Design a binder for this molecule. Sequence first.
Ligand code: PQQ
Ligand code: PQQ
Lengths: 236, 237
Amino acid sequence: ITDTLSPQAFEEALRAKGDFYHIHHPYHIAMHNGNATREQIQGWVANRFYYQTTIPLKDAAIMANCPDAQTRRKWVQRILDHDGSDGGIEAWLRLGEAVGLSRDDLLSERHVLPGVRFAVDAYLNFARRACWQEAACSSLTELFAPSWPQHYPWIKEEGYFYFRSRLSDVEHGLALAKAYCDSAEKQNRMLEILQFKLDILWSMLDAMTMAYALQRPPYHTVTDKAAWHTTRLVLE
Amino acid sequence: LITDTLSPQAFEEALRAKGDFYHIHHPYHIAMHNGNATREQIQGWVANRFYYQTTIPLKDAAIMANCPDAQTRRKWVQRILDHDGSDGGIEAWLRLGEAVGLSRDDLLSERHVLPGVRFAVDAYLNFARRACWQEAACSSLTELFAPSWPQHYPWIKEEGYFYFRSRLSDVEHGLALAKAYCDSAEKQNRMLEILQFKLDILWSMLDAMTMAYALQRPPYHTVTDKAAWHTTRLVLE
Ligand SMILES: O=C(O)c1cc(C(=O)O)c2c(n1)C(=O)C(=O)c1cc(C(=O)O)[nH]c1-2
Ligand SMILES: O=C(O)c1cc(C(=O)O)c2c(n1)C(=O)C(=O)c1cc(C(=O)O)[nH]c1-2
């Protein structure tokens, strides 16, 4: 971008990035067409649960950096949504039981791969350090975001549906990129922040590929046991 | 898992046992060491290891920003001096890059650095920024586990290669710190966890490079042939 794009040209630039959305990863494709194994489904739920539990922290980090009462009023709804005040992280826990993991397997974080954790912690850390407009606008990948019964009859229906139901906002993070990125300076940088975010989603699934699709989890050449660290070190 | 506090020497043994997990046991390191790596693999290893290397001094400065002990700073700043020159260990990597057929701009641009590498390496710097200075200083200890190309890869250039091995050539410090500081079972167990963390970073970097250069599945390989990952230290620049 050399000349400042208009609001609506900047929008299509932002959406042209949906071309790299994680639905295009082979791990995501082998899941939604029924070729994924039990280990792969459960491995996805457990790792993707890590992303889900970090997002309210990421959103709270944005609010800590935001002197604007009005924006905080609207942004806190994201935390209310995940934590419940119910709540989206409870939909993830029932999905975990639906695929044969327990609450303490998910809650413990032990199955979470180091490569997923690094990719997810990258998001949190960016949110912590970046100015709030920029962190807030990275949530925008959920524009690109909107079957398992037939595919995997072993998944419990009861829990699987509670995952679907519960998953009952972006009218924001887009109305704000266009409203904050009024130079080629800001636009270029927003497209790069957006790319960052897409890389995080792609890397989570790369980490899952190596471990569950390729039988190359960390240290596979040294042990058959899980040996990675399982702690959020700076928080716990 | 430590139930009863080990002696400092028993506790050194448990730290050193963690070398079983050192990144030399990764198939990507092994393929390089025994001559089965492609030039693409080697060049991408140098390009990506470079990012780790230019981050070390940032990480060391972070420990220092957190260290109110002048005496430790005096020892710790020496690592920055060795990396940055006063050249320059980072220069040794740059000359290694040229010997494998990368330009200095290739390396300094950080264009070729894979997101998986960036995230692992940035994890290390972020821990040093936020952890107390002792825990962060002790995570440097994987260096204890550290200490054939011309024959397997005769297309590697002589001078840059030699210069890299030359400029090659501190650690009696950070183990002393761990033995002195980790004086409870809780500190011990947490320090083995912080060392696992560090080990995981090293391993994750090689996984990222495996996916990209050994398996031909770099990010967005199903969408584009081109590098489309982000290439920026977003918070720093
Ligand atoms: O705050 C955020 O940034 C954020 C981002 C994303 C994302 O990047 O797609 C999701 C969510 N939240 C979320 O709650 C969620 O259920 C979700 C599902 C997906 C997906 O494609 O599977 N992304 C996201
Ligand atoms: O080649 C290797 O296997 C290797 C590993 C490590 C390590 O264990 O972190 C370092 C280095 N090399 C290295 O050259 C270096 O300057 C360095 C600094 C540090 C540190 O943690 O501060 N590790 C390493």
